[PDB]
């Protein structure tokens, strides 16, 4: 279950070391490719002409072993940001030499430190190697949660440690990483190897790393506590951080010497396995969404496009959704037909957008449990789904169900309905065009008629995720605007991210709509208080719907319907990341626009800084009518 590596700075014999490390149960070894003490000269004679091999041969291991079991480490003397010109020049040449050897060997990853504020020249040399040949290898930036200068023992008489809170100051190492990756222009081959110390910083320092591309977590043996039996364990707070890192599926790296001397070495790794086994089992939703974590998808458009058989099959796998619709229809039937009218009053029910028939079946189950009489119409514009419906109608339903192959906006209904039932909702509620569809169907609902759903509301929340920002960035396609990928929403199971403020309501629609000429166009301004230092990358979108009275469905995290997986959140990205300071307000503007052919969203950030208006006139994204 847990992927773990050993970090060594001393490898006297490569084959013997790998064997010992594999026996201990580790999956990989982080090790120096050149002797860490073997300082090399490239410019001055006589040392520049040092003979013999500069390092160990590639012949010592198989190609498979170099490709899968070895993570390279940059030599500790390589200081590209040195104040000394000579060191800076020798370090640039040595860094390029070591990175080129790593690429020669086909190493899956290479470790580089971020151990001071200024790594400008280290970033420049790294960016230059990245734009030179084979683009497969990963660079893991070794950065601590807490800088060595901020965790030093208070033992220097004339230099006391700072006992005052420095909110932004304690977040310093994040700015080391941020500046480095900004310089290297968000290369996807550049990730974080987060190093954990004996004492954890405040939660705000830890949360600063949310949404960051963490590929590895470094655990020094010195951070481990000892139990009554003498075996290495971790503090409750450390365990809480391990659990968070396990959800990100990071590779753990064990560094330092055995400090539990009379208790063997694999014990550190045995403890990580224990924590991994002793974690909460995933729920129905989590087991369903496994594989979709941060996987960007195009939002379905069931109006403009005809959904495929398997899409309808995925919809139907959600037990919660339909049992909620059944409960809403059941209550509505009881409210509309008194017990005394039980055998004479036949309610006309229209399922508008029937798909393969689950809401038709939900309506019939609802009528049986309410002990009421119903007359059903199943309206569906997709002719492929109409095949399934017509086969169901002949084989099972009978005359009680009339299947209609039509767009609900065009259908000349032969009778008026008591109840119209539909499920035309997207992840942002109105994004599949439920308002336009139900507005066109409204004329065949009786004056006292009920629409299920009765109402829906979309919600937005600002988010931070450099991981998702880079994921959207990589969606640049040929023959379109090079920035179009930032002007369109994505359906995504948000995972490695930070929600920056509580979701706030954006747009509301009510059915039936009794505000003449309707006007489904909308304009909303939202002001989000932010209590953290962060970077804004986009807005998470959710929704809630009132099916009937107290019977609802929600994907809003705080009121999420339990076990309901029909909708993942939506993400509205922004083109350029926005720095937000603690105590600032994020002000976002969202518009719902249309013409007679298409509906689209436009959005902009106006505080703390303005962004461009995204998707003007639906230039990058539209929803077909």
């Amino acid at each position: 279950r847990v992927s773990s590596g050993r970090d060594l700075n001393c490898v006297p014999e490569i084959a013997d070391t790998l064997g010992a490390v594999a026996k201990q149960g580790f999956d990989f070894l982080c090790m120096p490719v050149f002797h860490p003490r073997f300082k090399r000269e490239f410019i001055q004679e006589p040392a520049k002409n040092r003979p013999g091999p500069q390092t160990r041969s590639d012949l010592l291991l198989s190609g498979r072993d170099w490709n899968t079991l070895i993570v390279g480490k940059l030599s500790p003397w390589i200081r590209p940001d040195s104040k000394v010109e000579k060191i800076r020049r020798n370090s640039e040449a040595a860094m390029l030499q070591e990175l080129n050897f790593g690429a020669y060997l086909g190493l899956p990853a290479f470790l580089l430190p971020l151990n001071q504020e200024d790594n400008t020249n280290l970033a420049r040399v790294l960016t230059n190697h990245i734009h030179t040949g084979h683009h497969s290898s990963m660079f893991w930036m070794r950065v601590p949660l807490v800088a060595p200068e901020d965790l030093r023992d208070d033992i220097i008489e004339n230099a006391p440690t700072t006992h005052t809170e420095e909110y932004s100051g304690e977040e310093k190492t994040w700015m080391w990483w941020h500046n480095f990756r900004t310089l290297c222009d968000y290369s996807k081959r550049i990730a974080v190897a987060l190093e954990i110390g004996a004492d954890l910083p405040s939660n705000h320092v830890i949360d600063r790393w949310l949404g960051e591309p963490i590929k590895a977590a470094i655990l020094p043996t010195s951070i481990f506590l000892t139990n009554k039996k003498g075996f290495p364990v971790l503090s409750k707070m450390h365990q809480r951080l391990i659990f968070r890192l396990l959800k990100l599926e990071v590779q753990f790296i064990i560094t330092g010497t055995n400090h539990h001397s009379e208790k063997e070495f694999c014990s550190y790794l045995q403890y990580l396995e224990y924590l991994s086994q002793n974690r909460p089992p995933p729920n129905a939703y989590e087991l369903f969404a496994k594989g979709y974590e941060d996987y960007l998808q195009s939002p379905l458009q069931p109006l403009m496009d005809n959904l495929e058989s398997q899409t309808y099959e995925v919809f139907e796998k959600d037990p919660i959704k339909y049992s909620q619709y059944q409960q809403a229809i059941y209550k509505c039937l009881l409210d509309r037909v008194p017990e005394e009218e039980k055998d004479t009053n036949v309610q006309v029910l229209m399922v508008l957008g029937a798909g393969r028939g689950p809401l038709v079946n939900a309506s019939l189950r609802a009528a049986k449990q309410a002990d009421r009489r119903i007359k059903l119409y199943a309206v569906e514009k997709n002719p492929n789904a109409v095949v399934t419906l017509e086969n169901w109608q002949f084989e099972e339903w009978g005359s009680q169900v009339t299947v209609v192959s039509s767009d609900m906006r065009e259908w000349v209904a032969p009778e008026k309905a008591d109840i119209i039932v539909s499920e035309l909702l997207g992840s942002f509620a109105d994004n599949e065009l439920s308002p336009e569809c139900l507005d066109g169907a409204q004329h065949f609902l009786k004056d006292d008629g009920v629409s299920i759903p009765g109402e829906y509301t979309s919600f937005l929340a600002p988010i931070s995720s450099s991981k998702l920002y880079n994921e959207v960035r990589a969606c640049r396609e040929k023959d379109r605007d090079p920035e179009a990928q930032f002007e369109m929403p994505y359906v995504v199971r948000l995972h490695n991210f930070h929600q920056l403020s509580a979701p706030q309501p954006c747009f509301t629609f009510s059915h039936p709509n009794r505000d003449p000429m309707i006007d489904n166009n909308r304009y909303c301004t939202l002001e989000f208080p932010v209590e953290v230092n962060t970077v804004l990358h986009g807005f998470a979108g959710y929704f809630e719907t009132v099916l009937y009275q107290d019977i609802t469905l929600s994907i809003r995290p705080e009121t999420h319907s339990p076990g309901m997986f029909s909708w993942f959140p939506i993400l509205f990205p922004i083109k350029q990341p926005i720095t937000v300071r603690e105590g600032q307000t994020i002000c976002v503007r969202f518009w719902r626009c249309s013409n007679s052919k298409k509906v689209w969203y436009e959005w902009a950030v106006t505080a703390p800084v303005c962004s461009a208006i995204h998707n003007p006139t639906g230039r990058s994204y539209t929803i077909g009518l």
Binding site: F288, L296, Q297, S298, P299, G426, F565, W567, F568
Partner: peptide
């Protein structure tokens, strides 16, 4: 899943 299509 979750109202989405495409991706990879």
């Amino acid at each position: 899943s979750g109202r989405g299509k495409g991706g990879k």
